[PDB]
Copies of this chain bind each other. A is one copy, B any other.
C-alpha cells in the first residue's frame, strides 16, 4: 500500500518557539499520513551528512552546529506528491519570500532561523529518511479516512 514519502524536521528554533504541534497539525489536516517520528538531539556530524551537498557554502559549518544545538523532531510523512507538496506548505527557503499561509510565511523571518526542513526531491527524501530513521522506526498502517482522501 505504499505511497511516496518525505523527510520533515522541526528545527531547533521550531522546538524552542513551541511550534511542533502546529506544524504536525498542518500535515494531518492536509491528509498526509505520519509514517515515522522521533525526537532527538542530533550530532553535528549527522547534520554534516544531511546537508552534505552544501559542504562548501559559507553558512554550512554554522548551519550544522546550529541544527545540533537543540532537539529536533524528525518525521517521515507519506502521501501522493508529499515531497513537493510539503515544500509548498513550508514556503521558500527564505521566509522573506514565503507567502502568508505557509509555515515559514506565518511563523518566521530569517533564512538561518526558518523553523522547518523538508526533502527537496524523492531521491533526497530516500537518503534523508535512511539517514535519520532505522527501517523498523517506519510504521505501516492505514488511515481509516483514506477513502475520503484518495479515490
Contacts and interface: CB of A to CB of B under 8 A. Distances in A.
Contact of A113 (B103, B107, B148): B148
Interface-centre pick from A18, A27, A88, A108 (highest chain B CB count, 10 A)? A18
Contact of A31 (B30, B89, B107, B144): B107
Contact of A144 (B36, B73, B100, B145): B145
A102 B38 CA distance: 26
Given A24-B24, A38-B37, A151-B110, A99 B99 contact: yes
Contacts of A109: 30-32, 79-81, 85, 149-150
Interface residues on A, range: 35 or more
How many copies are assembled? Answer: 6
Interface in A9-43: 12-13, 15-32, 34, 36-41
A96 interface: yes
A126 interface: no
Interface-centre pick from A17, A73, A107 (highest chain B CB count, 10 A)? A17
A106 interface: yes
Given A39-B36, A71-B139, A149 B110 contact: yes
Nearest to A15: B34
A118 interface: no
